[PDB]
Amino acid sequence: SYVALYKFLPQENNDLALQPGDRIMLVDDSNEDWWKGKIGDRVGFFPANFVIRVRPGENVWRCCQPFSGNKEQYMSLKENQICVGDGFIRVSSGKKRGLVPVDALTEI
Q1: Where in the cell is it found?
Q2: CB of 37 within 8 A of CB of 58?
Q3: I need a labelling partner for 47 at 20 to 30 A (CA). Which of 6, 7, 10, 79 fits?
């Protein structure tokens, strides 16, 4: 599974529109920057760096309250930032992984 981290409105005709939290089925990745994927019955291009891989168990979350903590001990999340798999949960942003409070996340 892949998931859109960001909104992406189409600029050219063959672009595929993303909303954050969209689950995307891959169609072609021969270009390393621009991938072809499918959402519902819509097929098109979008930036590869706009999506994060979702392992089989993993859920998807939107950060409902900012949380910053010491990497040395914890992960950062700005408001509405998307992420992926008591009190804490280990999540990933794509760039960095770490613990955040579960109450700082909505499931999507």
Answers
A1: Cytoplasm, Cytosol; Cell membrane; Cell membrane, Sarcolemma
A2: no
A3: 79
Task: Classify residue 93 as left (phi > 0), alpha (psi -120 to 50) or beta.
Answer: alpha
Q: How many CB atoms lie within 10 A of CB 51?
A: 24
Method: X-ray
What does the chain come to in residues?
Answer: 108
Q: Please indicate, yes or no, whether residues 5 and 45 belong to a single structural domain of this protein.
A: yes
For residue 86, give its domain range.
51-108
Interacting residues of 40 by C-beta distance below 8 A, sequence separation 6+: none
Alpha carbon distance 98, 70 (integer Å): 10
Resolution to 1 decimal, in Å?
Answer: 2.5
Whose structure tokens read 């770490």? 98
Token pair, residue 39, equals 């959402």
Q: For residue 38, how many C-alpha atoms fall within 13 Å in the half-sphere facing its CB?
A: 6
> Taking the mean position of all CA atoms in its chain, how far away is CA 35?
15
Nearest by Cα to 96 from 79, 80, 83: 83
